[PDB]
């Protein structure tokens, strides 16, 4: 049935891609939200042992000053795609002498993911969310391991993805301020990650057209952590 991706199901489905779809769930909860004010991302930081370096779980990361990433799945295969997203901006710097849009970074990472079925390596068990404030404004995009990509006004991946998504559909619209989007995301996060929120099990970042700078909104976001 499912020894390799060289053949499909007798239904025509691959017995591999949906496996990546549930493998999305092996990681912690993760959220991304686009507003006219920018894009924000969040991931549960739930530690294995708190005496591990607490920032070493780099599931909320900056790609560049105007672009950030969040992941769901294993950190190992996520590292390759995140590094691709980061290095393409410097490639744009050294070739076109200007900045790169998040759409084309998305396209390049998609083509890198889309290699395991048309080479001549292996599927990546990670779902990625990018948020940019790029040359086309605020722009949140989502890739599943399948190598396709879609624009999203908001999105949820990782554990408890679909419940968070369905509950967020009640409290979202395309163009609010990113701050109240953060608040509405957090009031759902508080119940999605484990039971209670702190740096050991929560993490979030954001970027705005008024801030092409310091996506790492951590430990200064503390007030809205205690706003909820």
């Amino acid at each position: 049935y499912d020894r390799g991706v060289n053949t499909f199901s007798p239904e025509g489905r691959l017995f591999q891609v949906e496996y990546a779809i549930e493998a999305i769930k092996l990681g912690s909860t993760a959220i991304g939200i686009q507003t006219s004010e920018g894009v924000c991302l969040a991931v549960e930081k739930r530690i294995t042992s708190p005496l591990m370096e607490p920032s070493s779980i780099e599931k909320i990361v900056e790609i560049d000053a105007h672009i950030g990433c969040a992941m769901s799945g294993l950190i190992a295969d996520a590292k390759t795609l995140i590094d691709k997203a980061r290095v393409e901006t410097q490639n744009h710097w050294f070739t076109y002498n200007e900045t790169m849009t998040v759409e084309s970074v998305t396209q390049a990472v998609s083509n890198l993911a889309l290699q395991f079925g048309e080479e001549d390596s292996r599927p990546f068990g990670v779902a990625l969310l990018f948020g940019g404030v790029d040359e086309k404004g605020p722009q949140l995009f989502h890739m599943d391991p399948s190598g396709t990509f879609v624009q999203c006004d908001a999105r949820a991946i990782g554990s408890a993805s679909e419940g968070a998504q369905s509950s967020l559909q009640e409290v979202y619209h395309k163009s609010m301020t990113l701050k109240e989007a953060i608040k509405s995301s957090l009031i759902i996060l508080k119940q999605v990650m484990e039971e209670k929120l702190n740096a050991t099990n929560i993490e979030l970042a954001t970027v705005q057209p008024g801030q092409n700078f310091h996506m790492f909104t951590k430990e200064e976001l503390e007030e809205v952590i205690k706003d909820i």
Binding site: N6, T7, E118, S146, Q165, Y172
Partner: protein, 238 residues
């Protein structure tokens, strides 16, 4: 059953059923349409939603200023083939500065679709392609399938819920040929309206069209560009 493997293996019947599995993979839902006229060719692909906070996915691509395509699935092989068509058109302009005719381009795409089907180490294509174009010979609608065949058609439709669309197209092939651009796109959208689910009427948020003709490049139209084409649509009688 052992004979459900690499396209290198024939079943005892003399068939490669994995190609049929790719073909059935193509048939998995909402409708797409393609049809041409004396003046123009048109393709339509509805942008399927995901949620109230996620965007509809575009399913139409531009290849050259006389040719474009439409795509069904998760675009694993479809978009790559579209890019190869774009590079081939660029090579045609590099060699003779001409947008090469539709059929002779699609023949090479058919050959490329056949190439994996003989050898190991490469899965068959999981998408079906629709093509609308015009050239120095005329306007054409083409379509290609995982079985590596290519078809010049007056009308075509891939997916599910589209047999009603296919029957409407089979009925009004008598009109599709002589229509103008607007009449042709009206016919295509009527075929699509034949695909309406029980609880729905066509919305701008999903309908997306690509159009080409004898005096128009291949271009893409959305929402309020589709609406000037949605007018003249079939009504809802009983």
């Amino acid at each position: 059953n052992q004979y459900d493997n690499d396209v290198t293996v024939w079943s005892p019947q003399g068939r490669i059923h994995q190609i049929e599995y790719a073909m059935e993979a193509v048939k998995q839902g909402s409708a797409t349409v393609g049809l041409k006229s004396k003046t123009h060719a048109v393709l339509v692909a509805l942008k399927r939603a995901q949620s109230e906070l996620a965007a509809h996915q575009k399913k139409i691509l531009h290849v050259d200023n006389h040719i474009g395509i439409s795509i069904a699935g998760l675009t694993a092989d479809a978009r790559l083939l579209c890019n190869f068509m774009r590079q081939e058109c660029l090579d045609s302009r590099f060699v003779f500065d001409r947008p090469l005719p539709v059929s002779r381009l699609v023949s090479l795409i058919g050959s490329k679709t056949q190439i994996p089907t003989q050898r190991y180490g490469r899965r068959p294509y999981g998408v079906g392609l629709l093509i609308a174009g015009y050239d120095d010979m005329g306007p054409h609608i083409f379509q290609t399938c995982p079985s590596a065949n290519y078809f010049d058609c007056r009308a075509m439709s891939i997916g599910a819920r589209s047999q009603s669309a296919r029957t409407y197209l089979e009925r009004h092939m008598s009109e599709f040929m002589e229509c103008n651009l607007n009449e042709l796109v009206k016919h295509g959208l009527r075929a699509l309206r034949e695909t309406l689910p029980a609880e729905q009427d066509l919305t701008t948020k999903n309908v997306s069209i690509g159009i080409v003709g004898k005096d128009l490049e291949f271009t893409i139209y959305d929402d309020d560009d589709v609406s000037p084409f949605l007018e003249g649509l079939e009504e809802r009688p009983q």
